[PDB]
Amino acid sequence: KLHKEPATLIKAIDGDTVKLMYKGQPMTFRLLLVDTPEFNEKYGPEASAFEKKMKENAKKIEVEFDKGQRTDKYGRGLAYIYADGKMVNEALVRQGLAKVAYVYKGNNTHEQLLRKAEAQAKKEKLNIWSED
Numbered sequence: 001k002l003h004k005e006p007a008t009l010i011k012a013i014d015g016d017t018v019k020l021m022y023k024g025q026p027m028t029f030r031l032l033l034v035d036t037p038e039f040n041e042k043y044g045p046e047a048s049a050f051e052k053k054m055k056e057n058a059k060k061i062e063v064e065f066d067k068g069q070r071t072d073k074y075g076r077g078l079a080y081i082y083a084d085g086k087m088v089n090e091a092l093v094r095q096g097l098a099k100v101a102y103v104y105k106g107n108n109t110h111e112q113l114l115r116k117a118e119a120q121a122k123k124e125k126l127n128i129w130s131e132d
């Protein structure tokens, strides 16, 4: 079963990338199963701001690797990130600040959960989904 590990949020890089202190060393993590806009694209600032708000307000950050590859081709950890028990990946999607994306079968544990959040965000026309 997947498991959550301790970490500390050092820097929000952008809406879906964070620098964490993991096992006492800095490591950049890309969130699984999501794609936020770049900082210079519409909703980019907002998505970055959501991560920054987590850093600022979350008392507890946890990293959950999925069942497959743990590091991408750029050396970034690939994980689900939780803030005070709330999955950041899911929250971004639920708020329409990320699309479900990069769904590889080896790391797909939370796919249907996120697709559920996406469908709600789309029905509500939030953020990314408010755009025609």
Ligand SMILES: Cc1cn([C@H]2C[C@H](OP(=O)(O)O)[C@@H](COP(=O)(O)O)O2)c(=O)[nH]c1=O
Residues within 6 Å of the ligand: 017, 030, 031, 032, 033, 034, 035, 072, 073, 078, 101, 102, 104, 107
């Ligand atoms: C989420 C995720 C992204 N990536 C890679 C694919 C994209 O690489 P390429 O673009 O070279 O194909 C890149 C997107 O990252 P960003 O969305 O952070 O720019 O991250 C993975 O390899 N595995 C993943 O699970």
Ligand SMILES: [Ca+2]
Residues within 6 Å of the ligand: 016, 035, 036, 037, 038
């Ligand atoms: Ca992105």
